[PDB]
């Protein structure tokens, strides 16, 4: 059931790379100021949005500029580019509303950011990626470390591995030998010999 | 922490709480906060982030 | 971290070994004005401050 | 008896160079190369392709090979440059997973801050090390010498005892661990700034900066700081030899729909173009190349452009509200 | 390595102090303050300079 | 029997006078009693030097049937006793 | 670092009995024996030809991947020691991509390689106690005026 | 169509090692008294001899 | 599990791209070609059979090669071509004159046995057909169509009458009788023919060279349908550029002197800057068609092939010259 069962666990099953998405995951750190008030604190872990993304706050602390608190909260991650404006929404809560938010990073899609599209739940309910398909690896997760009582949802992917260069190579290099006519010459040593 | 009290809730699935007296303070002090949950991490069910 | 120390030693050094601390390292500061009409012409000192 | 007998090579660079090529080639508009990535062939190879084991009949060239390529196509995809970035294998210092994570050979590259274990130092990105130099005792790569400088002094690989103690640090260009102790020596090379490193970085391959995207900003890839001695450089992929690129891409059921619905066997076998032309309604027309990410292979001139790689896999599915991502690389 | 020292020959400054007195031995120090390790540490050392 | 497919007359180990076994262990043969393993090829790692016994695969079986000889038993005048005792449990144990 | 007054102390920590190290060449199948009683388990360290190798044992193969320096000690019945590794065996398909991970945690040491391994014979019953000491080595240069018990 | 292979799946449902199944009696004897016969000790006796 | 393949075609592609990115002066690559080591690599070096040491790529090994180098040579695109190997009906002297393989590539005009036709350029034909007996290279099969259906090499056994002929599609010898059939490619007009051609390999047009003349190649004939064309290189699938460049002892007297023995190895070298009095000076990349490595800047540029010979001994007033094909 730790991370690191999931991914080892094709290793030796599909001896083929996977991931899975939880929100906190290894990355941490953040960089934006947040002007709220009195907010619960309740939702520190539980993400919350603009159209980039959203990502999940371990805690804040709040400090003080005019005298309106400054939450600086602290999270995992990032989905989407941050802006300083941006149209903020507690993935947990419909009831709360943030600040516009100072840091930036983002993180990439085809389409980046936007509304995406329908959003389960708070759809965070945690992803998976592999290239093997499921159905082929959907039973024995659930039936080995991926635990009952959650679903989760699961994008695939694939990679190509091509030897360019190998076949690149030099094949032989050559060389001449000349007399060039420049005029400014006599004839003297030898003679003749080639005639044509 | 005098002792770490680990609790839930059933409404936010996810996550994981515990209680902590550093019993060097009344709240329990932040670098402690970051340090452990670091420490933590290693162990976390990945359904799960403990909190 | 690690190392006790305890009723122990004499020595600084051996602690030294780690006090933990910090350590060198270089930065570069700036662009450059010539004095007068070539830069090559001109040199550098920085006393600490 | 053979007069003359000589001997020559071409340095790991020139497959580098090639690359820097071969990424200015692509084009916007002009004159440069066009690439569209295309799949097809919803018809199955085998009744056994479902089965475990199952390969697909290794693909076939010729202007045969092609038409039947170019007749199943499902659909096409066009490849920003952006989406194509130069990588190196990434190696992390002290990660489990890997074997000998405390263990580093000369000339290893070792990425730092990439997590918690391996972090040293917060609030910064990911660093970029190479370790010179290992611990004096340790292994031969040749059998018949036991000192790491001898076995050095012949050139043969020589693997280190002694495990490193801690991940590399410092900006400073000498500076691994040389003063107190270590057997190891790191060089430092530049930071990842963290974002790339989330949406670029495979755990298997860190993303490796453009000298020109480099030329943008030398601070946000840490490299402003260094030295060069040339002036602005910036062509720090010739440092790092990096020998591959990794074509990024991104399939969607919404331009091909009708891949895409239930019940659909998917597609065996990819297929990438370069620089095909438009489909024109008056073959004296004049030729057009392919803006949009996506044409239906109808849209397309047949058979224009040339292709230079062809796929078989067995059957995948796509499906629709699923989102596909396919990654290509090259080692040229 | 911060410092607690100097202000030497018992200047008003300092308010380091030993106090021998009443039979025993008093010895004074102000609160210390450290910062910006940024790094992990454990214990800490009064070095005599 | 059981040395015979690996070989005959094996030397199975070097024991010291103190009586500690050495195990993979064999004379560079210069100085007899410097020993430097094997898988070495020697001229390295002595990791004993002196004068140790080797061990014949013969002697070698001797000294594990030997130990055999002494047995922990229960006395002839108890053995009659003992035995309904038991005997008497089988009944409990046999429902 | 050599202290002021030309010497130092260090700190240093001990154990039990001696060292053996042994050098074996791998093969495919042989079970790599410590025919020796009194060897410690965590005084045990092997080096494949080039390295150094961890084990689990105590922890976990699901932890890290297929791909991993690594051994297992175990036990045999006859009351030695065996101990072995994975092989998490490596490939490349081209030479494109990374080096592949298959098999199980582990990584397996291709035929012949050379494997010494480092451990200690051990008298653990008089282990304890053991107050008095002494310097039995010879160092040059390195003279210890004095060790300094219980120390720290 | 149904299951097309290549030498695939393991050993049944579940392992037999199977020298241990216990074999009918005659066969036992069938093997058996091959076991007798090519003994080097005596490649005379026939054993169908009663 | 998959199965994938790159066309031959991205041989030529590279090349393309590669042809295209020499540069002029800006941002595009700029080549040079060294030449260095008047010092011997053993006493022996002379002798025959004498191969020098196995180079070594390295910072070392570059630092060395970038010591010794004696002199350095740009080279101009022109001076690079794509090439095929050429092969000639009719030639008696090398085997099987007159025996073709499917789609090899036959020159002729070359030569007055090759000559049908004279007031033409070469010509360059490709062998779609070939007499039906023959030798599969399976040697399990007997049939041409057999062997070749299957898809194993096939050797006729019957030679061809006369090299190919017309501008037509396939020709090919087709109608009246042959086993050959022929289809036309280009005519090489004579002065790029005598000037740039090996007698092993032909060399092929560029594209762009070719968007000039169609008529000076005799492509201008055919039929492409998609307008323009000109990619023909695709059709040869051409994999193999021919560096041309030409060594003089007068830009380089020094090494030229009578009594030298000669450079051992050469090294070309990509995009090196020119010296600089003074380092915070803007870099210079090099124009000029020869520079003494002291001329240029220390490590400049980047040279991706790196060389060892046994001694060759330039001299004053000889003229020396250098061909270097690559297979991308």
């Known amino acids: 059931g730790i991370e690191a069962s999931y991914k080892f666990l094709f290793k030796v099953l599909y001896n083929e790379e996977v991931e899975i998405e939880i929100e906190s995951g290894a990355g941490t750190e953040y960089d934006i100021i947040v002007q709220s008030d009195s907010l619960t604190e309740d939702l520190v872990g539980q993400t919350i949005y603009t159209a980039t993304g959203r990502c999940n706050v371990t805690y804040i602390e709040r400090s003080y500029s005019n005298g309106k608190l400054q939450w600086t909260v602290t999270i995992h991650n990032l989905l989407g580019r941050l802006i300083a404006g941006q149209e903020v929404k507690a993935e947990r809560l419909p009831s709360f509303e943030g600040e516009i938010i100072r840091g930036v990073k983002g993180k990439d899609l085809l389409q980046n950011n936007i509304d995406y599209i329908n959003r389960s739940r708070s759809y965070y309910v945690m992803k998976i990626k592999s290239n093997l398909p499921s159905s082929r690896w959907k039973s024995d997760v659930i039936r080995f470390v991926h635990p009952v009582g959650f679903g989760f949802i699961a994008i695939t992917l694939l990679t190509m591995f091509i030897n360019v260069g190998l076949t690149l190579k030099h094949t032989e290099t050559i060389i001449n030998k000349y007399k060039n006519y420049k005029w400014d010459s006599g004839l003297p040593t030898e003679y003749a010999d080639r005639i044509a | 922490i005098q002792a770490v009290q680990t609790f839930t809730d059933s409404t936010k699935p996810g996550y994981a709480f515990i209680a902590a007296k550093p019993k060097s303070g009344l709240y329990l002090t932040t670098v402690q906060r970051e340090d452990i949950k670091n420490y933590l991490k290693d162990y976390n069910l990945a359904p799960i982030t403990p909190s | 971290e690690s190392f006790q120390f305890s009723p122990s030693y004499v020595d600084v050094s051996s602690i030294s070994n780690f006090i933990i601390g910090e350590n060198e390292y270089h930065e570069i500061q700036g662009s450059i004005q010539q004095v007068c009409k070539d830069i090559n012409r001109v040199y550098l000192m920085e006393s600490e401050g | 008896d053979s007069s003359v007998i000589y001997r020559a090579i071409v340095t790991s660079k020139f497959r580098t160079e090639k690359m820097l090529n071969f990424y200015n080639s692509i084009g916007s508009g002009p004159d440069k190369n066009t690439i569209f990535i295309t799949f097809g062939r919803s018809e199955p190879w085998s009744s056994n392709e479902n089965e475990v084991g199952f390969a697909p009949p290794y693909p076939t060239d010729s202007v045969l090979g092609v038409t039947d390529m170019w007749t199943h196509m499902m659909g096409t995809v066009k490849v920003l440059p952006s989406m194509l970035d130069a990588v190196i294998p990434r190696r992390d210092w002290g990660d489990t997973r890997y074997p000998d994570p405390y263990t580093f050979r000369i000339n290893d590259i070792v990425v730092c801050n990439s997590a918690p274990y391996n972090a040293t130092e917060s609030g910064a990105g990911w660093l970029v090390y190479r370790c010179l130099d290992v611990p004096d005792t340790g292994m031969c790569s040749i059998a018949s010498l036991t000192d790491k400088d001898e076995c050095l002094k012949l050139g043969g690989k020589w693997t280190p005892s002694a495990r490193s103690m801690t991940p590399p640090e410092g900006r400073g260009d000498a500076e691994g661990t040389i003063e107190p102790g270590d057997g190891y020596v790191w060089e430092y090379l530049f930071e990842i700034p963290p974002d790339v490193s989330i949406n670029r970085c495979t755990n298997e391959y860190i993303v490796v900066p453009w000298p020109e995207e480099l030329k943008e900003d030398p601070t946000r890839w840490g490299y402003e700081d260094n030295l060069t001695w040339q002036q602005d450089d910036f062509g720090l992929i010739y440092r790092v030899k990096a020998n591959t690129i990794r074509f990024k891409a991104y399939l969607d059921s919404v331009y091909f729909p009708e891949a895409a619905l239930p019940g659909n066997k998917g597609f065996r076998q990819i297929s990438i173009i370069t620089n095909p032309l438009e489909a024109k309604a008056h073959p004296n027309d004049p030729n057009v190349k392919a803006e949009k990410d996506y044409y239906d292979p109808e849209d397309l001139m047949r058979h224009s452009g040339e292709m230079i790689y062809m796929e078989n896999r067995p059957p995948i599915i796509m499906a629709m509200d699923q989102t596909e991502e396919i990654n290509i690389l090259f080692t040229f | ?49 | 029997q059981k040395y015979k497919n690996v070989g005959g007359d094996q030397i199975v180990y070097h024991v010291n006078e103190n009586g500690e076994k050495f195990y993979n262990l064999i004379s560079y043969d210069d100085n007899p009693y410097v020993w430097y393993d094997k898988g070495d090829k020697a001229r390295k790692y002595p990791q004993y030097e002196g004068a140790l016994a080797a061990v014949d695969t013969y002697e070698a079986a001797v000294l594990e049937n030997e130990k055999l000889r002494q047995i922990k038993i229960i006395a002839k005048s108890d053995i009659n006793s003992f035995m309904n005792d038991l005997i008497r449990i089988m009944e409990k144990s046999y429902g | 670092i050599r202290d002021k007054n030309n010497q130092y102390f260090p700190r240093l920590k001990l154990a039990q009995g001696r060292i053996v190290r042994t050098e074996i060449i791998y093969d495919k199948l042989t079970p790599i024996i410590i025919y020796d009683k009194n060897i410690d388990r965590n005084q045990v360290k092997l080096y494949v030809d080039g390295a150094e190798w961890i084990n689990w044992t105590r922890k976990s193969m699901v932890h890290a991947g297929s791909t991993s320096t690594i051994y297992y000690m175990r036990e045999t019945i006859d009351g030695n020691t065996e101990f072995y590794f994975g092989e998490g065996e490596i490939s490349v398909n081209a030479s494109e991509g990374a080096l592949t991970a298959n098999y199980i945690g582990g990584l397996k040491p291709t035929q012949n390689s050379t494997i010494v391994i480092e451990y200690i014979s051990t008298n653990g019953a008089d282990a304890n106690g053991a107050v008095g000491f002494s310097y039995a080595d010879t160092l040059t240069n390195i003279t210890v005026i004095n060790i300094n018990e219980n120390p720290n | 169509a149904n299951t097309p292979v290549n030498y695939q799946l393991t050993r049944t449902a579940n392992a037999i090692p199977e020298i241990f199944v216990g074999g009918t009696f005659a066969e036992i004897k069938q093997n058996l008294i091959e076991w007798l016969n090519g003994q080097n000790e005596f490649l005379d006796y026939d054993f169908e001899g009663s």
Do not use: Q
């Open chain 5, 1 to 49: 390595t911060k410092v607690i020292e100097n202000i030497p020959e018992t200047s008003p400054d300092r308010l380091v102090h030993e106090y021998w007195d009443d039979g025993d031995c008093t010895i004074v120090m102000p609160n210390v303050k450290f910062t910006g390790f940024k790094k992990y540490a454990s214990g800490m050392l009064f070095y005599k300079a």
